[PDB]
Amino acid sequence: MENVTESKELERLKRIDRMKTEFIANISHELRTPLTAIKAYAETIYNSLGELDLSTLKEFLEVIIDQSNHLENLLNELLDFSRLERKSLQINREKVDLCDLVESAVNAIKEFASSHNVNVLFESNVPCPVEAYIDPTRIRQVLLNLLNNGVKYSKKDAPDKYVKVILDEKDGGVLIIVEDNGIGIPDHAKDRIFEQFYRVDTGLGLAITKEIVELHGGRIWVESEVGKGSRFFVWIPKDR
Amino acid sequence: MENVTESKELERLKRIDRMKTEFIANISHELRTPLTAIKAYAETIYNSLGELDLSTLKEFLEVIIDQSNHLENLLNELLDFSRLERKSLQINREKVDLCDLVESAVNAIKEFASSHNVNVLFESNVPCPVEAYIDPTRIRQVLLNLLNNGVKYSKKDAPDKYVKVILDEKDGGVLIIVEDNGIGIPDHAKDRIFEQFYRVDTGLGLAITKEIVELHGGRIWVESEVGKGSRFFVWIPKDR
Numbered sequence: 463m464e465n466v467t468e469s470k471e472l473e474r475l476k477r478i479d480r481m482k483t484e485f486i487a488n489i490s491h492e493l494r495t496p497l498t499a500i501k502a503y504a505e506t507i508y509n510s511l512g513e514l515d516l517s518t519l520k521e522f523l524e525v526i527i528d529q530s531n532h533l534e535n536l537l538n539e540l541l542d543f544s545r546l547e548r549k550s551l552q553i554n555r556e557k558v559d560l561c562d563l564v565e566s567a568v569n570a571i572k573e574f575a576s577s578h579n580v581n582v583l584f585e586s587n588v589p590c591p592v593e594a595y596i597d598p599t600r601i602r603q604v605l606l607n608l609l610n611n612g613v614k615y616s617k618k619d620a621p622d623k624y625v626k627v628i629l630d631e632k633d634g635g636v637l638i639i640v641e642d643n644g645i646g647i648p649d650h651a652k653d654r655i656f657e658q659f660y661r662v663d664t665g666l667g668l669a670i671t672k673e674i675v676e677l678h679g680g681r682i683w684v685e686s687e688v689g690k691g692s693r694f695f696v697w698i699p700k701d702r
Numbered sequence: 703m704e705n706v707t708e709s710k711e712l713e714r715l716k717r718i719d720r721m722k723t724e725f726i727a728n729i730s731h732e733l734r735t736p737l738t739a740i741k742a743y744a745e746t747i748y749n750s751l752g753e754l755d756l757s758t759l760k761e762f763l764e765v766i767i768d769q770s771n772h773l774e775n776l777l778n779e780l781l782d783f784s785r786l787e788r789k790s791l792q793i794n795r796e797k798v799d800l801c802d803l804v805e806s807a808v809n810a811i812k813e814f815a816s817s818h819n820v821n822v823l824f825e826s827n828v829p830c831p832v833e834a835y836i837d838p839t840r841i842r843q844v845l846l847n848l849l850n851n852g853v854k855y856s857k858k859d860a861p862d863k864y865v866k867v868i869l870d871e872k873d874g875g876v877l878i879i880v881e882d883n884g885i886g887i888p889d890h891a892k893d894r895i896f897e898q899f900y901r902v903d904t905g906l907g908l909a910i911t912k913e914i915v916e917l918h919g920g921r922i923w924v925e926s927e928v929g930k931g932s933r934f935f936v937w938i939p940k941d942r
């Protein structure tokens with residue numbers, strides 16, 4: 463005989479492992495380009511030491527730095543991936559004005575949004591600044607995933623594609639809503655979209671977004687209607 | 703009811719996954735030190751550009767290079783790990799003199815061997831050079847794991863601890879034996895030691911060693927007696 467739940471789990475684990483394997487394989491390769499550009503603009507330099515003008519320096523130095531910043535972002539994706547695996551991701555909270563955090567995020571996503579003819583808005587039902595004891599870097603990361611998704615899953619047939627961040631306070635905490643009039647999400651998938659790798663049909667997406675919110679002691683969920691759009695809710699403690 | 707083999711597999715897969723997770727976590731962290739030293743000896747430099755003598759250069763450049771070479775070795779361990787996972791590791795064969803390859807390997811392990819009072823020997827039952835169409839870098843890696851193991855598992859109570867590489871030709875191919883008079887290996891573990899992570903009780907050990915040999919079309923196995931020592935055999939096609 464057999465245990466069907468067990469078999470489904472085993473099969474589920476093997477398919478997830480294939481995906482983790484492909485993730486690790488891809489990031490391994492991407493880490494190569496930078497480590498290449500870094501070395502190049504260096505072992506070459508050292509060896510031609512006795513024959514170099516220092517012009518072949520300020521521009522070149524900028525290269526190692528741009529490349530290094532690229533390798534750093536990649537190592538961070540790998541480290542985020544590892545930390546999410548081990549549930550060891552941490553947050554470092556401080557007093558932050560959520561209004562500024564949101565405007566900045568909206569700013570960073572403006573180019574991509576325009577690229578798809580999607581307008582990004584921000585509304586606060588409470589006077590700014592809206593101070594919260596949170597990890598600014600992490601919640602910016604939260605928000606950006608949310609915003610990027612609002613653009614990516616916008617509804618082609620809508621003349622007014624948009625993604626709007628609504629800020630507010632509730633139940634003693636802060637409620638952030640990222641609303642879009644996109645394609646929406648089917649009922650069977652409203653919890654599953656938060657699982658690593660899941661897609662209704664690198665980055666860590668909604669899975670790290672959920673972990674960041676939960677680490678703050680909050681909750682995230684979605685309310686959506688296919689063809690109409692989705693509202694992702696993020697409730698976090700405000701006070702601390 | 704249930705399928706016992708299935709349950710054992712599931713449990714086996716989860717424990718292996720914990721180990722892969724810890725491997726990825728550790729290499730992620732180690733990659734940090736170099737990327738740190740690299741940037742440091744750089745973003746600092748660029749910013750103090752208008753005030754720097756070029757002495758704060760040749761020694762410093764050496765730092766970025768030593769560090770880069772360290773990051774490169776680490777990225778290679780991660781990439782080897784990934785390739786072993788996907789069975790996508792490749793070899794690039796060429797005409798190689800196995801005698802020189804072995805002497806070089808023995809040379810590289812001499813310090814560590816001395817550290818444990820283990821003598822390393824090399825014998826060839828055929829006149830050198832012993833030419834084989836193989837991947838030099840990979841077979842050096844094979845051999846070094848083998849040699850390192852011979853030192854690591856040497857028998858404390860032996861006055862003449864040693865590890866000897868014996869070169870020879872057989873069945874139309876080349877037979878390499880790495881013999882030690884170490885602690886030996888129990889019967890139940892003679893195939894299992896080649897599995898990733900297995901220990902009778904970073905690097906990839908015997909698992910990548912086996913993959914490298916098999917990619918050459920060869921075979922590896924061990925013959926051992928607890929308390930007496932082990933002989934690891936590597937038979938590979940010679941001709942190609």
Ligand SMILES: Nc1ncnc2c1ncn2[C@@H]1O[C@H](COP(=O)(O)OP(=O)(O)O)[C@@H](O)[C@H]1O
Nearest residue numbers: 611612615644646655660661662663667668692
């Ligand atoms: N605003 C949204 N509208 C519709 N579907 C969404 C939205 N945000 C997320 N999803 C669903 O959740 C899945 C996972 O999202 P995410 O983790 O960000 O990865 P992808 O966005 O798939 O890398 C998406 O593939 C999609 O099916």
Ligand SMILES: Nc1ncnc2c1ncn2[C@@H]1O[C@H](COP(=O)(O)OP(=O)(O)O)[C@@H](O)[C@H]1O
Nearest residue numbers: 851852855884886895900901902903907908932
């Ligand atoms: N020469 C040897 N003598 C005794 N045991 C050995 C030898 N080589 C390998 N082994 C066994 O195989 C296991 C796996 O070896 P390896 O993959 O090199 O990892 P460790 O060497 O465990 O990182 C060892 O933990 C040990 O139990």
